[PDB]
Short mmCIF file of C-alpha atoms and ligand atoms in Angstrom, two decimals:
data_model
loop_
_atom_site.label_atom_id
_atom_site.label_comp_id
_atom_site.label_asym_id
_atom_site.label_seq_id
_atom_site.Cartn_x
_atom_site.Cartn_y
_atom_site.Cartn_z
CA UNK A 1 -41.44 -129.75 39.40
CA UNK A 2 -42.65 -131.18 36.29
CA UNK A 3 -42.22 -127.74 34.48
CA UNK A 4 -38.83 -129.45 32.62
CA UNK A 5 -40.34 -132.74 31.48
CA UNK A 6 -42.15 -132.43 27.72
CA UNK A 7 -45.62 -132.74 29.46
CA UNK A 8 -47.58 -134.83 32.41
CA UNK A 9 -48.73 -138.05 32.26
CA UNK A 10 -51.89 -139.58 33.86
CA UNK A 11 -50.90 -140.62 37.22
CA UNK A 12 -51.14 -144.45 37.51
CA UNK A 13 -53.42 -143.73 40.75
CA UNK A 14 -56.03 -141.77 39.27
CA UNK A 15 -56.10 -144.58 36.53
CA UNK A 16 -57.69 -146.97 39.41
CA UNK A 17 -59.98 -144.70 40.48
CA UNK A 18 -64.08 -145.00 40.20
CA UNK A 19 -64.87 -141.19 40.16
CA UNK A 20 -68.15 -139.61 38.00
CA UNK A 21 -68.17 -137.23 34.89
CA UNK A 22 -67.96 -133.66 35.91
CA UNK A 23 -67.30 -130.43 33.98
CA UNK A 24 -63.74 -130.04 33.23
CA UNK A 25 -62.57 -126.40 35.05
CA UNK A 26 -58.87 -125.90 34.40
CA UNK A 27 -56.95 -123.49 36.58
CA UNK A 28 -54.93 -122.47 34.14
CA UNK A 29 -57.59 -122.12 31.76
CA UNK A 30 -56.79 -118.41 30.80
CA UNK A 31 -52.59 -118.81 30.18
CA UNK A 32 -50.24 -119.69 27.53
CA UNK A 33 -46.79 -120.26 27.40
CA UNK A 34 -44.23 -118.74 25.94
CA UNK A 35 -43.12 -120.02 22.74
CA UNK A 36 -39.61 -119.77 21.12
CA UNK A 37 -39.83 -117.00 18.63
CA UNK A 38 -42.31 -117.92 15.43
CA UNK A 39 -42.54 -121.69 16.68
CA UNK A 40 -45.98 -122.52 15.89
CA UNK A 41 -48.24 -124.25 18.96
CA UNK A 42 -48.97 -127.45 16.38
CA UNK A 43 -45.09 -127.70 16.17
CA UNK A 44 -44.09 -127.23 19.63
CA UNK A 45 -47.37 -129.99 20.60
CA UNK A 46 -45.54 -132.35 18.44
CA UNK A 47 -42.57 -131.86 19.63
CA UNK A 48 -43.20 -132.04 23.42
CA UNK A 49 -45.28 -135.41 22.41
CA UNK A 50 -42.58 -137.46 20.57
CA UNK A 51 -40.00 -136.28 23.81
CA UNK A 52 -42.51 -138.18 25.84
CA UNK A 53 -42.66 -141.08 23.47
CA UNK A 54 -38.64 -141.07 23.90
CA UNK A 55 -39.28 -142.51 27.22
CA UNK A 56 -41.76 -145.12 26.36
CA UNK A 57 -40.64 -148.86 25.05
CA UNK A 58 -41.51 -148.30 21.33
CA UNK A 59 -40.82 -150.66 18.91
CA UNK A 60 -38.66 -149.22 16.29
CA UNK A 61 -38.28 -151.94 13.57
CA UNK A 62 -36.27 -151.35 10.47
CA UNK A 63 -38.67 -150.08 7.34
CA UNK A 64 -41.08 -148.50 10.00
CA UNK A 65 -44.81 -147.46 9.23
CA UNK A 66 -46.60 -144.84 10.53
CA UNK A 67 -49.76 -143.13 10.26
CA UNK A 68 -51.22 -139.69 10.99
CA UNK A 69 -54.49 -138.93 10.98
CA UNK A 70 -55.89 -135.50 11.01
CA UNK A 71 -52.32 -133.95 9.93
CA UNK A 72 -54.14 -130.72 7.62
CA UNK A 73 -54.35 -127.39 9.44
CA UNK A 74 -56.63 -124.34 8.28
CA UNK A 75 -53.61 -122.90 6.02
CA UNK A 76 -52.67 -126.30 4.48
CA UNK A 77 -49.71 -127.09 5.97
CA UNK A 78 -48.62 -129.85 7.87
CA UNK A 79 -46.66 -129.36 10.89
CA UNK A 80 -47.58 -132.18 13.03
CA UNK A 81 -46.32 -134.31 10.23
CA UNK A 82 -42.67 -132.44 9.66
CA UNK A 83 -41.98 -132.77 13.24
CA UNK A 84 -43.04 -136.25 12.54
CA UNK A 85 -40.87 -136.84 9.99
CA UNK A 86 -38.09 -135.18 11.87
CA UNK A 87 -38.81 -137.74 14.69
CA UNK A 88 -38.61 -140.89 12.70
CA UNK A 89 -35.38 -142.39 11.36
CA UNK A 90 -34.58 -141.76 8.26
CA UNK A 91 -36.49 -143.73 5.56
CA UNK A 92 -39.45 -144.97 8.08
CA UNK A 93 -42.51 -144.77 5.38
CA UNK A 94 -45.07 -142.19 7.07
CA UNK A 95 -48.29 -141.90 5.46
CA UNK A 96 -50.65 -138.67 6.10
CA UNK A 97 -54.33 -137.97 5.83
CA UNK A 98 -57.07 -135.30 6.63
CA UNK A 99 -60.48 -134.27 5.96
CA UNK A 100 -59.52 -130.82 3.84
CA UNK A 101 -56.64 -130.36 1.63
CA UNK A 102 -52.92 -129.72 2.50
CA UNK A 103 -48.84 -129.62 1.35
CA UNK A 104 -47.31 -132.41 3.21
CA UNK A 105 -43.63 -133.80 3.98
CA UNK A 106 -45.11 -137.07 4.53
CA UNK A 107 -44.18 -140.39 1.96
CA UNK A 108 -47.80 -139.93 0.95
CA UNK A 109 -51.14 -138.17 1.68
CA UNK A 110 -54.87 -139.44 1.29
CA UNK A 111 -57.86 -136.15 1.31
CA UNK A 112 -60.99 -137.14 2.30
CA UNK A 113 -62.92 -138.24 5.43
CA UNK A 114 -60.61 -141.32 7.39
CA UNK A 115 -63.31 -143.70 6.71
CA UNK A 116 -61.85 -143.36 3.16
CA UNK A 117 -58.53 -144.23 4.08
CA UNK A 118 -57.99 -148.21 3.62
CA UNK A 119 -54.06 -149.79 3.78
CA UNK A 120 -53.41 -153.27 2.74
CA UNK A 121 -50.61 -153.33 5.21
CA UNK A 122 -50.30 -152.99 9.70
CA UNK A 123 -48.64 -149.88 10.84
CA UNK A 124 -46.15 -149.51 13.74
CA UNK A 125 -47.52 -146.52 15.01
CA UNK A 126 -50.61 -144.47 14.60
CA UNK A 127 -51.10 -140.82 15.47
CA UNK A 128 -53.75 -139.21 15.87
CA UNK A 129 -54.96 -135.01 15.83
CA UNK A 130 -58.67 -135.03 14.84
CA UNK A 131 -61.19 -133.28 16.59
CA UNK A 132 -64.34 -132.19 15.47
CA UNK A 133 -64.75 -128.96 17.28
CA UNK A 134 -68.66 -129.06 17.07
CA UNK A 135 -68.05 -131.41 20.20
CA UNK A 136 -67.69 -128.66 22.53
CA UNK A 137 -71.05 -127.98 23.05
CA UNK A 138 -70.79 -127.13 26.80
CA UNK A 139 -75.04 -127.30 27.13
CA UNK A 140 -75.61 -131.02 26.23
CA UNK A 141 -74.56 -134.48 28.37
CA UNK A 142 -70.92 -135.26 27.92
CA UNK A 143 -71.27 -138.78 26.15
CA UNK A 144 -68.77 -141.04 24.50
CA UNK A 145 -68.83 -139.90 20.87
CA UNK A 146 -68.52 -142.11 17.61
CA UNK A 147 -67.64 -140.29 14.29
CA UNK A 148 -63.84 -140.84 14.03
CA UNK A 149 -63.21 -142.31 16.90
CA UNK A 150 -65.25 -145.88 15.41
CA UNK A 151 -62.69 -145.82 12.53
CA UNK A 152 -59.59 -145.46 14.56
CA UNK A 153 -61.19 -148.05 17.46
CA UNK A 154 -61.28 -150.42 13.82
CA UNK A 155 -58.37 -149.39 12.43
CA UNK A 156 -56.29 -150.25 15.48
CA UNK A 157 -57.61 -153.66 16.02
CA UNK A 158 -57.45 -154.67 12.08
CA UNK A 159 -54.01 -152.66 11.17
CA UNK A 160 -52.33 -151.98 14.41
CA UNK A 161 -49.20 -154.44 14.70
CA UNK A 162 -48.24 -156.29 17.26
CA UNK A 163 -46.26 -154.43 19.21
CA UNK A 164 -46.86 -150.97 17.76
CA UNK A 165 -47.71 -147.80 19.37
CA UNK A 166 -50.54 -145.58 19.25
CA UNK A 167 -51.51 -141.78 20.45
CA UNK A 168 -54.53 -140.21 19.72
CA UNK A 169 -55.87 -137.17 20.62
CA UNK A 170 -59.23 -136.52 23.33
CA UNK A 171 -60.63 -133.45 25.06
CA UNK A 172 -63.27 -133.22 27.58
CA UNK A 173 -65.65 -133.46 25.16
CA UNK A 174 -63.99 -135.43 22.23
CA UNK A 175 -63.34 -139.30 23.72
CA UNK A 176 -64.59 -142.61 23.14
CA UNK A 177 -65.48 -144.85 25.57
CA UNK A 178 -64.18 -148.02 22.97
CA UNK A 179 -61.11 -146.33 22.86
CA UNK A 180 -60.67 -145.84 26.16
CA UNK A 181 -61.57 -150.17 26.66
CA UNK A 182 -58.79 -150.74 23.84
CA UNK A 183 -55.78 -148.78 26.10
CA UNK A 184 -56.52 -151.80 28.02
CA UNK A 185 -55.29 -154.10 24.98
CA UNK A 186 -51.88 -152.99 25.50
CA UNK A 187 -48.67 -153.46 27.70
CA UNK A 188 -48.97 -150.57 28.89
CA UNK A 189 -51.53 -146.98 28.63
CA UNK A 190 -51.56 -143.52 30.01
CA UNK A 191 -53.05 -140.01 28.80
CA UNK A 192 -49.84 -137.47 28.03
CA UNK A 193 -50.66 -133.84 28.75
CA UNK A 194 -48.17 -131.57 26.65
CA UNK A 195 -46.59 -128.64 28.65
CA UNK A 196 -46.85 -126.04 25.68
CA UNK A 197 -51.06 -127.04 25.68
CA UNK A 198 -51.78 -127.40 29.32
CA UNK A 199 -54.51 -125.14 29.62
CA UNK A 200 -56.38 -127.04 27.15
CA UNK A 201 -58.15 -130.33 28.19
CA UNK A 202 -56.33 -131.80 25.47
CA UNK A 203 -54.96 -134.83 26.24
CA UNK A 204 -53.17 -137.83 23.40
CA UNK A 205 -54.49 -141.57 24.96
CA UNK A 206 -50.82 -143.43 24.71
CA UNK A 207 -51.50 -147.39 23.79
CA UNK A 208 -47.74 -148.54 24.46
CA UNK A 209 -47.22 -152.11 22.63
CA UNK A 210 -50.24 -153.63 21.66
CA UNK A 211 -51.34 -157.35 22.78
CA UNK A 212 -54.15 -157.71 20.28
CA UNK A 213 -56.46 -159.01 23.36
CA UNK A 214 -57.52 -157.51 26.64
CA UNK A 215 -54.67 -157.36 29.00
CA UNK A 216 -57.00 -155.25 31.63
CA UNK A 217 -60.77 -154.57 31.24
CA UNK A 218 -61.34 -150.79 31.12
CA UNK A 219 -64.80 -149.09 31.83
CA UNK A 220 -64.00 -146.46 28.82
CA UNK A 221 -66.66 -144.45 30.61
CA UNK A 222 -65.48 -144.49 33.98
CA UNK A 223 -61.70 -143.81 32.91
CA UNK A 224 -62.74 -140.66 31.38
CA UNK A 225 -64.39 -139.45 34.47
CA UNK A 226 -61.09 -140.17 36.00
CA UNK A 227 -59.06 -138.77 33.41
CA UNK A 228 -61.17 -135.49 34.28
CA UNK A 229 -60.92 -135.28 37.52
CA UNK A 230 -57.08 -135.81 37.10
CA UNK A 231 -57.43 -133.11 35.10
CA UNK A 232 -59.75 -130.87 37.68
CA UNK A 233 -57.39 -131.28 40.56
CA UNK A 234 -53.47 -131.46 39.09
CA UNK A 235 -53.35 -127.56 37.59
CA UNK A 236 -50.41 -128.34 35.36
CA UNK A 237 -48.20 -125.07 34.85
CA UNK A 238 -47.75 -124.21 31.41
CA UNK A 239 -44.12 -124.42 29.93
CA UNK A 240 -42.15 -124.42 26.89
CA UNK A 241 -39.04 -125.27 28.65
CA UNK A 242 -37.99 -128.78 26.59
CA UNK A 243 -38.39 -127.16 23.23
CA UNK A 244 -34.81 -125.84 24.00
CA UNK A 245 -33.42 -128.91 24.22
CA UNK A 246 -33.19 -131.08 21.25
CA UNK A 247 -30.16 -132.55 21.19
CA UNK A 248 -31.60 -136.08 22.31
CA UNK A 249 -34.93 -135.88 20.13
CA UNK A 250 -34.41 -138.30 17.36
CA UNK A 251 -36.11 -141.70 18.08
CA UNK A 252 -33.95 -143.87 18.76
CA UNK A 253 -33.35 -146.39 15.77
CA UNK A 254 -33.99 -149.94 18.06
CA UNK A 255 -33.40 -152.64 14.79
CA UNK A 256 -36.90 -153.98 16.80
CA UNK A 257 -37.51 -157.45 14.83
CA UNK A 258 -40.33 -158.11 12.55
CA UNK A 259 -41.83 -161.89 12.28
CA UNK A 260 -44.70 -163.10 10.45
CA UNK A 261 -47.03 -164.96 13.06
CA UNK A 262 -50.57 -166.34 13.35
CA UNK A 263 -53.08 -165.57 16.06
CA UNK A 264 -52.47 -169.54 17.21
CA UNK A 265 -49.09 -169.22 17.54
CA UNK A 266 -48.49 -166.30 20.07
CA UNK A 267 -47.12 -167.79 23.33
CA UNK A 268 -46.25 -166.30 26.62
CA UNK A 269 -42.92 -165.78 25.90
CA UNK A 270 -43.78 -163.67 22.33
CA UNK A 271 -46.62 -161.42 24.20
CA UNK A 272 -43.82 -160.85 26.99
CA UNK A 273 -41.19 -159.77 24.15
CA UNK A 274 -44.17 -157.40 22.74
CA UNK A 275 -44.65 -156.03 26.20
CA UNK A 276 -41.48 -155.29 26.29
CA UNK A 277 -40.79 -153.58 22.86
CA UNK A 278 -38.86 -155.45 21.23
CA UNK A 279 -41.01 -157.50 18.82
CA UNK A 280 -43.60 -156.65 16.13
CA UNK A 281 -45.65 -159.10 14.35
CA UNK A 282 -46.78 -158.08 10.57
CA UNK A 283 -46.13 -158.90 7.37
CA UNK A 284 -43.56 -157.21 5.98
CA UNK A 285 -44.44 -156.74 2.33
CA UNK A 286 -45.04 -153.22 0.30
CA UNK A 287 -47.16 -150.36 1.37
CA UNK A 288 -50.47 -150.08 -0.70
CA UNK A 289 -53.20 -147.41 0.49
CA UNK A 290 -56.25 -146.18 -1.34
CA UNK A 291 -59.10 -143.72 -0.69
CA UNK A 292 -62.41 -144.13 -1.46
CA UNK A 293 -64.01 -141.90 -3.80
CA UNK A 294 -68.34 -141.64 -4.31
CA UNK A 295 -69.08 -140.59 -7.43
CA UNK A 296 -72.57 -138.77 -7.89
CA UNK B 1 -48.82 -122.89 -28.30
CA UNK B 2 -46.00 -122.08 -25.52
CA UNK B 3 -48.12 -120.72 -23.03
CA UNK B 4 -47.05 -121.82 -19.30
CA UNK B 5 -47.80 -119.81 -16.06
CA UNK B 6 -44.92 -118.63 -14.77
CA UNK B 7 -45.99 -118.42 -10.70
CA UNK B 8 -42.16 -118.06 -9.91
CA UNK B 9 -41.63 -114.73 -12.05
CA UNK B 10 -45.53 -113.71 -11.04
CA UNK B 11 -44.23 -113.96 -6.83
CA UNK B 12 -40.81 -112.14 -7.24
CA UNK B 13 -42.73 -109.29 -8.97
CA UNK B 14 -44.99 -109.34 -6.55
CA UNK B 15 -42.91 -109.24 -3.65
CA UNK B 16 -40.57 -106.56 -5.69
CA UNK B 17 -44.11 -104.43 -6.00
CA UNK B 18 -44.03 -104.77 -2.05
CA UNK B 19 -46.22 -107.62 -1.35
CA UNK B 20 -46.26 -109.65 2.03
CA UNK B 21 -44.15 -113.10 1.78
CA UNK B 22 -46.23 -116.14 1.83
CA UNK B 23 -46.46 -117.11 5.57
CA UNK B 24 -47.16 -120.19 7.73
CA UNK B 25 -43.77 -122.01 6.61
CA UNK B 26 -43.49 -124.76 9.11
CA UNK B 27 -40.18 -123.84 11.16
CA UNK B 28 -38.46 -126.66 13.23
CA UNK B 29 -37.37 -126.93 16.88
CA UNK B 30 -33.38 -127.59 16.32
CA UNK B 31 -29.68 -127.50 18.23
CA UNK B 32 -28.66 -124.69 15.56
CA UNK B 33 -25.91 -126.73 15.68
CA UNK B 34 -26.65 -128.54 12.63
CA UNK B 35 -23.74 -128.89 9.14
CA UNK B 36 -26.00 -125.74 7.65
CA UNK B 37 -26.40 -127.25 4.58
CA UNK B 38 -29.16 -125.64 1.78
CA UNK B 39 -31.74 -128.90 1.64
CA UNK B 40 -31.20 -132.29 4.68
CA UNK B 41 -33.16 -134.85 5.51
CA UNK B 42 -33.64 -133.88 8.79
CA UNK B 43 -32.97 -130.54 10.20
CA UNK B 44 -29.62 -128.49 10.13
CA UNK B 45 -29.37 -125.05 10.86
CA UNK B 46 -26.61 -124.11 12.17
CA UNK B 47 -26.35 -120.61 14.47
CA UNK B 48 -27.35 -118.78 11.64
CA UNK B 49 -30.29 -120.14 9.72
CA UNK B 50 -33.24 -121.59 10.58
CA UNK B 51 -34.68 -125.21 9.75
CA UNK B 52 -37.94 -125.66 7.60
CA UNK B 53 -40.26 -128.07 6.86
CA UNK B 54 -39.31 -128.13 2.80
CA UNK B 55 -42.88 -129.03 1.42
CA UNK B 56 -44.19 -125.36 3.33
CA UNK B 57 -41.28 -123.27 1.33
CA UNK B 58 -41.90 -124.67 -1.88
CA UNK B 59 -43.63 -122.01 -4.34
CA UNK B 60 -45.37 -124.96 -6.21
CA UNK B 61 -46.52 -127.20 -3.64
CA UNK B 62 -47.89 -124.00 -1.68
CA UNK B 63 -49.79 -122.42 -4.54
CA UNK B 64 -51.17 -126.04 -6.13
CA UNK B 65 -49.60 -126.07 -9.08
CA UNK B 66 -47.12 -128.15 -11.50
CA UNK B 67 -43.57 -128.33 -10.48
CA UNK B 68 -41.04 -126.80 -13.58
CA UNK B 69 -39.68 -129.59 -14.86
CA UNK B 70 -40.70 -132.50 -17.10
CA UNK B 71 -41.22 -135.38 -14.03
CA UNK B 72 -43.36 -133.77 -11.87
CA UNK B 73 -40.53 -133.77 -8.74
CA UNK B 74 -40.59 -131.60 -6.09
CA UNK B 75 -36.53 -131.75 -4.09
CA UNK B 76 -38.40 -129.90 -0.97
CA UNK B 77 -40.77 -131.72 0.24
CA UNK B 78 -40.12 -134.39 2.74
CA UNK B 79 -36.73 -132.77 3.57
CA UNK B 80 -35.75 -129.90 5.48
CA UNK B 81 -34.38 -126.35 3.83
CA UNK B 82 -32.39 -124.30 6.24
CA UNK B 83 -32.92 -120.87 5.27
CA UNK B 84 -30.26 -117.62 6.55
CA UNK B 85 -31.95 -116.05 9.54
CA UNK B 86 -32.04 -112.73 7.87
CA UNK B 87 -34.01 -114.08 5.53
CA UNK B 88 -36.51 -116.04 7.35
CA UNK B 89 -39.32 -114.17 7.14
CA UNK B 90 -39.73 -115.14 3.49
CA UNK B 91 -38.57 -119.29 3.18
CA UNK B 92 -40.15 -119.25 -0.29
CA UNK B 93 -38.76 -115.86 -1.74
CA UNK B 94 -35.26 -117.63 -0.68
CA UNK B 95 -35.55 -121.27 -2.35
CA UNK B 96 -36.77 -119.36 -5.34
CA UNK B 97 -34.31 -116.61 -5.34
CA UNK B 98 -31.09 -118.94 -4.31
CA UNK B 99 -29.20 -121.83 -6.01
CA UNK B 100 -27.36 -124.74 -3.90
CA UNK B 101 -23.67 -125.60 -4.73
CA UNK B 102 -24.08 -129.18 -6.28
CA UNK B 103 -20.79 -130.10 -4.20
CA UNK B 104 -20.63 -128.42 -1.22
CA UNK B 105 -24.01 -129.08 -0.19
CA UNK B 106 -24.34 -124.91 0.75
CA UNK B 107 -26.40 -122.00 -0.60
CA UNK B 108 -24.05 -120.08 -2.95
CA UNK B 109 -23.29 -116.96 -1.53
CA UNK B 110 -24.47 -118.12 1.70
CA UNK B 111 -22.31 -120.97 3.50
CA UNK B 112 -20.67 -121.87 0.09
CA UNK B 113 -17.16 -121.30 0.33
CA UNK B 114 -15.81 -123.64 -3.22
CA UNK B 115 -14.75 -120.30 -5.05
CA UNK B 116 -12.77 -118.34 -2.57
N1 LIG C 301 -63.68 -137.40 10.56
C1 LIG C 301 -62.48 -136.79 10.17
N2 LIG C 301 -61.78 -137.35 9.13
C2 LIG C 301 -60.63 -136.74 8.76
N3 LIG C 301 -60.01 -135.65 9.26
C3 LIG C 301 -60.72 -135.12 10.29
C4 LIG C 301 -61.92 -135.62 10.79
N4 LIG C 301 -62.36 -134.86 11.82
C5 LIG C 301 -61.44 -133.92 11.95
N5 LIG C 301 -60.42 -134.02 11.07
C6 LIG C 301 -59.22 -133.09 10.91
O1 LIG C 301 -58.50 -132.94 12.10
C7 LIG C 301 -57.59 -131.84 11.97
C8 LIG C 301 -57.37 -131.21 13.36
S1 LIG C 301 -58.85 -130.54 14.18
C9 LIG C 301 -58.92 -128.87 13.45
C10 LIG C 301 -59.67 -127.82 14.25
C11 LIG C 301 -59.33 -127.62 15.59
C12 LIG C 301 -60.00 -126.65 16.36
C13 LIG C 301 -59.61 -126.47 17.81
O2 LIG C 301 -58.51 -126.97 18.18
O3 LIG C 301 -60.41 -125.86 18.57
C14 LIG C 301 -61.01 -125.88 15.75
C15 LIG C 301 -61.36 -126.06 14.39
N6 LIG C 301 -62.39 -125.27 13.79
C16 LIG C 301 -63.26 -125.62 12.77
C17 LIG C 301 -64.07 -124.51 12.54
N7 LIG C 301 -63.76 -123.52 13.35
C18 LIG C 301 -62.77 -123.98 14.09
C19 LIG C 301 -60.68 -127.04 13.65
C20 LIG C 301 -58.25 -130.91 10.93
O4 LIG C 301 -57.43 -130.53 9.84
C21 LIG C 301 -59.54 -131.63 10.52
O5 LIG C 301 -59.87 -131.52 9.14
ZN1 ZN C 302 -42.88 -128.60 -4.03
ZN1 ZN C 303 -19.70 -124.88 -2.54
#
């Protein structure tokens, strides 16, 4: 039983499948779990996701970056971002962003839509919580959606390093098919369903070490569809179980090695280091951000 | 003209006149086995307190306003305060209300043991 693990990931099988959209119908629709007493649900999601990024090959480089998108909540807070924070070794810069204002434990934090938010420098990792809830419209054709998805598709390919990690959130409704056709620029992909939020359709797209070029071509359409029906057919039974258990959470601090290294000059052997984790390619200077501001 | 808001004195008289506690403090998943010191850079309750996010506990960054004191620092936010469980229903009340012992690392009068 997968009732211990942190969450469920996407079953490489259903990956090669060629199903069509349906309607997503969870079976467990209706439950929650359990949480430990006043642990909020954005705390415990966090949680259960960085366990399961424990057990991926992350590269973990000395003075790591990382972004979070869509990190505000309705009462200003950020919890996605402290359990961040927690997460990441000591000193790793993490920079934080949302539409609507909010307190934050992160390095520093940029208000305003993400199409705002520009960064001189690549990131190791990017994370990912918007969702636009006027999405779940359940009366209209379930089509690949643009809004925030076309700035993260962008701002993976232009500030993703090689080698860094990325997790962004979907729902039935809330995907992109780009994004989807991206996974397929990295070592390795799957779609990580947290215990504590399996009732939801919620799902955070994993890109594990990115290539910078198609390692598979993904129909971002058709992987949806089978993302869904994964989904339709695999009730997942809710659980907090993990959250007990944090005596292993800290990622672990890897000393992953940084070089500076043009597109030319990528062989075989340095995309086979990057599949591995345990190489990223970026500059290593300071971190400058900005956010756009229209006046009148 | 010496007129500054004073949001600390304005929240302990409100909580003395019987006010709810601000709420939504971001508390941590954590052993509880942690050195219990006051204010860590990552979390450290031990059996007895629980482990905050420091940035939600902070009376200034909460309310948007200035931090009291001439830089503009905040020493919560982007750490984590552990806070006595008794008292966690009110994180803020408590960094407010409580000092930390500049060499044990403890709240006085709760973990600080340098004057017994
Ligand atoms: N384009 C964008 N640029 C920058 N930030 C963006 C962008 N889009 C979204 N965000 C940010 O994502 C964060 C998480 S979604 C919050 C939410 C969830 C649910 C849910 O779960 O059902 C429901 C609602 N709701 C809204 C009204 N009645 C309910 C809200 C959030 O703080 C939001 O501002
Ligand atoms: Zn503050
Ligand atoms: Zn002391």
């Amino acid at each position: 039983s997968q009732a211990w693990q942190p969450g469920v990931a996407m079953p490489n099988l259903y990956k090669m499948q060629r199903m069509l959209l349906e309607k997503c119908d969870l079976q467990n629709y209706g439950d929650s779990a359990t949480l430990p007493k006043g642990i909020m649900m954005n705390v415990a999601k966090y949680t259960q996701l960085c366990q399961y990024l424990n057990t991926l090959t992350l590269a973990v480089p000395y003075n790591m970056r990382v972004i979070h998108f869509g990190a505000g909540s309705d009462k200003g807070v950020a919890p996605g971002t402290a359990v961040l924070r927690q997460w990441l070794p000591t000193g790793t810069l993490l920079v934080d962003s949302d539409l609507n204002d909010f307190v934050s434990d992160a390095d520093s934090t940029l208000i305003g839509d993400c199409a705002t938010v520009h960064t001189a420098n690549k990131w190791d990792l990017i994370i990912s919580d918007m969702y636009d809830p006027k999405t779940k419209n359940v009366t209209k054709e379930n089509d690949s959606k643009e809004g925030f998805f076309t700035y993260i598709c962008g701002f993976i390919q232009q500030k993703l390093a090689l080698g860094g990690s990325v997790a962004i959130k979907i729902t039935e409704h809330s995907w992109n098919a780009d994004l989807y056709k991206l996974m397929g620029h990295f070592a390795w992909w799957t779609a990580f369903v947290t215990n504590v939020n399996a009732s939801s359709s919620e799902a955070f797209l994993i890109g594990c070490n990115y290539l910078g070029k198609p390692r598979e071509q993904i129909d971002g359409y058709v992987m949806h569809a089978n993302y869904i029906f994964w989904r339709n057919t695999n009730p997942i039974q809710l659980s907090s179980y993990s959250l007990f258990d944090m005596s292993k959470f800290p990622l672990k601090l890897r000393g992953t090695a940084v070089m500076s290294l043009k597109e030319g000059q990528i062989n075989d052997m340095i995309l086979s280091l990057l599949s591995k984790g345990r190489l990223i390619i970026r500059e290593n200077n300071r971190v400058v951000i900005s956010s756009d501001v229209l006046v009148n | 003209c010496a007129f500054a808001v004073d949001a600390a004195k304005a929240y302990k008289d409100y909580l003395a006149s019987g006010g709810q506690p601000i709420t939504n403090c971001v508390k941590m998943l954590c052993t509880h086995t942690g050195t219990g010191q006051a204010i860590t850079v990552t979390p450290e309750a031990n059996m007895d307190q629980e482990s905050f996010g420091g940035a939600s506990c902070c009376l200034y960054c909460r309310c948007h306003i200035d931090h009291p004191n001439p830089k503009g620092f905040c020493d919560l936010k982007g750490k984590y305060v552990q806070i006595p469980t008794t008292c966690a229903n009110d994180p803020v009340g408590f960094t407010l209300k409580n000092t930390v012992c500049t060499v044990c690392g403890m709240w006085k009068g709760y973990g600080c043991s340098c004057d017994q």
